[PDB]
Amino acid sequence: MDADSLLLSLELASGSGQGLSPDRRASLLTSLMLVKRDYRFARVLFWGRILGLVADYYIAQGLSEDQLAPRKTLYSLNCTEWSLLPPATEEMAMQISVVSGRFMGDPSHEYEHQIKEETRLVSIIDQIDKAVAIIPRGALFKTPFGVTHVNRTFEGLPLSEVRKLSSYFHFREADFLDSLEYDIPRGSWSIQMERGNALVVLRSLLWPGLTFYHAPRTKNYGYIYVGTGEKNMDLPFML
Amino acid sequence: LEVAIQNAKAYLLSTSSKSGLNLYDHLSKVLTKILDERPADAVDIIENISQDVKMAHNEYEMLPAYEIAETQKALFLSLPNVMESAYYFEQAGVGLGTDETYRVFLALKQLTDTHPIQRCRFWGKILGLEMNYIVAEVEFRDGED
Amino acid sequence: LEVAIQNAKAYLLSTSSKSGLNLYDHLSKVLTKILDERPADAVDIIENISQDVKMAEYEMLPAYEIAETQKALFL
Amino acid sequence: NLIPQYAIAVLRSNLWPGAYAFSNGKKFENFYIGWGHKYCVENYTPPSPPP
Amino acid sequence: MPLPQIYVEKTLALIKPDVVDKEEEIQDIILGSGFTIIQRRKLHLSPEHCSNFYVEQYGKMFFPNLTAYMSSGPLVAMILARHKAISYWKELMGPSNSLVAKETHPDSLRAIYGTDELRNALHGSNDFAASEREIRFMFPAVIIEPIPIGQAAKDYINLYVAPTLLQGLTELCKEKPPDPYLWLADWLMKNNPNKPKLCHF
Amino acid sequence: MDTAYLKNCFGTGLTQALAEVARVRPSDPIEYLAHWLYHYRSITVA
Amino acid sequence: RDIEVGFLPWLMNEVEKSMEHSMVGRTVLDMLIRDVVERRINDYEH
Amino acid sequence: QDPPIERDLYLSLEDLFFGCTKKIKISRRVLNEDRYSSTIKDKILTIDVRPGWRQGTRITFEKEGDQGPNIIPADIIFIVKEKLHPRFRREHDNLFFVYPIPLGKALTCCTVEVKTLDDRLLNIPINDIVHPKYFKIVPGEGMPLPENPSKKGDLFIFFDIQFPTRLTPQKKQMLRQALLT
Amino acid sequence: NLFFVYPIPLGKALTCCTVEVKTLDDRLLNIPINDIVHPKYFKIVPGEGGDLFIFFDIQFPTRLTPQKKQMLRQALLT
């Protein structure tokens, strides 16, 4: 989510209820203005929160002119000091699979299953971004220059094709992206609406904690993940 | 008529800040590729013709928002509880909401940390023509600055 | 040349049976929607205006239904 | 945490995600919002069939 | 020039580094008068870039203080289109030597936003060929009318490009590599008459 | 002959490259010619 | 020797024809602009 | 044939980052056809620096002047040396950043404020332990390749640990419990 | 000139203690450390070998605890 949705306090109104504080709302507004200042990102989004044991993780992501570029994600604990996370490889992705346990805090923490805490944070961030990141239909326009830009004449999603599920894409490399109907397993998205037809709520079930708001008549969209930091493989037992 | 013609052409020669191309030259290349090879369905191929045309020390400017983000960094680095008062503000349809009154409360915290103030409560706001006024009552301990 | 002007005008004036409109009136309506005072970044949206001019209640009634249920909360 | 003189202590259960309890401490309130599930450090092992 | 074509002339408006912080008010003046903004570039004029931009004046007149002045801050360059753009830009802009222009033309831009000769308020192109040279040097690949149709462009290629193209296509025939776009591009970036040889390490 | 080889090799691509060389006149037209040859490669291959 | 008689004058003739086509496309676009502006002036004021 | 001159010329790190045009004066030892002046008509030669060149690329002005009985002189105007930048010192497709640190602050979740050549304030944390022989990998930023301006290099952050010298023995007595245990 | 490198740990580095730089000739001695060691620093010991020189190599720990860390912060950053 952008800072504009941080102004409207739309995380609580999505209904997930883990939410954000005016502490962290003002802190993300000023500090993401700083993140847009120091690093020359086209757009800076508050990615979300990773639930901790001694300290709370606050994650934001920056994007270049190409909208499908590898993002330079950032982390902060006291919500002012943003620091650049390293990019993730597959070697660090299969490294953290032997560690099963809650996200603790204090990023120099070491796992005996050594394995650093920051590597776990970065690999978990790439896993969530590759799995359950969400872009609606017509939000991104594939330019013939080879880059992806924000479609600025994006009319919001009509009420007929909100519930298909074939009108939501992924915010990564692949109407030129892969839809939600091919997600494994099927039915792994909590399809919901708010009061009236004013906002569409999508909650990921492969990762419990991401919420996607979408106003069907305006250009308002974005994903925030506030939650456990774990991929539940218990999801086929739930459905 | 000629002034409006040149104004419309200057509208069409204006360069976008995203792609770096002009609309007049793009439509000229589209019409040139249309007049080169002519299919029967001229209207319906305007997608692919316009898409195929698109295949073929600049400083950065500081916002004023950069300057106010510089000034509001120090807010996040003997008062009364402003926050319950701000919750009671909103039931009357009154006040700054949450974010602007919390920046007010942080400026109050910086003022109380700067000066030896016994009681530093939010007096209120005075609306202005170009800039606002944020007013705080201050009671000094020793009576000095 | 003026003969090339007349030949290209006759080429643009040729209609299509699959749409019922020619390229000249389509580009004229596109330029009509362009020449109102839009900000000068219409290069990316010159396609989307062409789909907008080429294109030119029951799905909303659930909001009416929850608004029916919601009005008894304060009455 | 920025202004700690008027802070409220926010409890946060890790056994039940989304479970909280609150100070000032003169009075208190309890609130839960989540999926109604108990957190396990491992995956959900199914209950074994009877012998 | 003829009846079914039109001539939308262009000129360059330069915003000097003393007045770049006051850019919104003078932008209101130039937009309200009738001049249109084609594209605005915020460019830091290098001392080694100002001389190639000013071969017309600095190449024959000794004035290094203005060359140091253009590198003292940011420079905003814009393209203008208007009916009689050169004449109206000279009328609104006024003559130079802003100490005298504060007394002769008090409603001009240099009378308000200017201080002296070298610390000028603005800079504008005088002739159409000078405007074309200024626009072609500062700005990216934009098209400036007239398009030189007929024998004008053929002579330009035949005395600027096609000798090098003939020497490239002579060596491209013997031998014949597959996908000859690689060989032509490497020959043009290698055997460049206007660019020196490059040897990376 | 080599004339038929240069006929079948580039043709309209080199014609369009020299057309924008004659239309847009940079400081070095050779570098712009090679850059548009690379861009025409990237167009006709992808 | 062969290029000066063969591929190069044909390349210049094709470049001149392509610039003629680009010029005629630019002026029919300008004619469309003139028709649109004249129709808007005659219709919006009446 | 006379050997050509090899002038060592210094370019800054930000100039090699951005690729700015340079104006260089040359020698005036070429005889004209009029046999009255030794000044060449091309006083300054127009160049173009590509972003991210190597330390020592050879740029050759082949057949410059073309004067002499059997000598065709050439000018090697570029022996690419680099100025002593106060922050970064480069390597092949790489930049190492040497940044001073205190021993009580080196051991932390560190704050490395890296002001790059693009005037970007990079904030890179250190959460591994800090050896004297320790470096980190910050991919995606550096000087770009001479073949690819768009894709960048790598940053390595090196550390100079300054041990304190004025510890009174109470902190030594409890530093016996602060490192040994 | 004869010299050797001793890998002293960081725990015995910042604290005053005794180190054992045994010579290769006559089995002596337990010379204590007085000043705080630097990475680029040496002592001087009289003898013949051409005098003996000692270089100190610092070995850093790998794993630490948050309370261990905070009381190290009270040790070093104060």
Residue numbers in the entry:
A (entry chain H): 1 to 113, 133 to 193, 212 to 276
B (entry chain S): 206 to 261, 271 to 291, 310 to 377
C (entry chain G): 206 to 261, 273 to 291
D (entry chain G): 615 to 665
E (entry chain E): 5 to 205
F (entry chain A): 1 to 46
G (entry chain D): 285 to 330
H (entry chain B): 136 to 316
Please quote the paper that reports this structure.
Radial spokes (RS) transmit mechanochemical signals between the central pair (CP) and axonemal dynein arms to coordinate ciliary motility. The RS is a macromolecular machinery consisting of more than twenty subunits. In this work, we reconstitute a mouse RS head-neck complex and determine its near atomic resolution cryo-EM structures in both monomer and dimer forms. Our cryo-EM analysis on the reconstituted mouse RS head-neck complex revealed the presence of both monomer and dimer forms.
We then determined the cryo-EM maps of the RS head-neck monomer and dimer at the consensus resolution of 3.28 Å and 3.57 Å, respectively. Furthermore, we conduced focused refinement on individual portions of the two maps, with the core region of the monomer reached 3.14 Å resolution, and the central bridge as well as the head regions of the dimer reached 3.36/3.46 Å resolution, respectively. In the monomer structure, the head portion consists of a compact body and two extending Rsph1 arms, made up of two copies of Rsph1/Rsph4a/Rsph9, with the composition and conformation resembling that of the previous mouse RS head core structure. Rsph3b is attached to one side of the head and is intimately associated and stabilized by the neck subunits Rsph2 and Rsph23, as well as the head subunits Rsph4a and Rsph4a’. The Rsph4a N-terminal Dpy-30 motif extends to attach underneath the head subunit Rsph9 through rich H-bonds/salt-bridges and also clip the neck subunit Rsph3b. Indeed, the Dpy-30 motifs from not only the head subunits Rsph4a and Rsph4a’ but also the neck subunits Rsph2 and Rsph23 wrap around the long α-helix of Rsph3b, so that Rsph3b intimately engages the head and the neck subunits. The RS head-neck is as well connected with the arch bridge through an intense H-bond/salt-bridge interaction network between Rsph9 and Rsph16 and H-bond interactions between Rsph23 and Rsph16. The I139Yfs*8 mutation of Rsph23 truncate its C-terminus, which is responsible for its binding to Rsph16 to stabilize the head-neck complex, and may therefore induce instability of the complex.
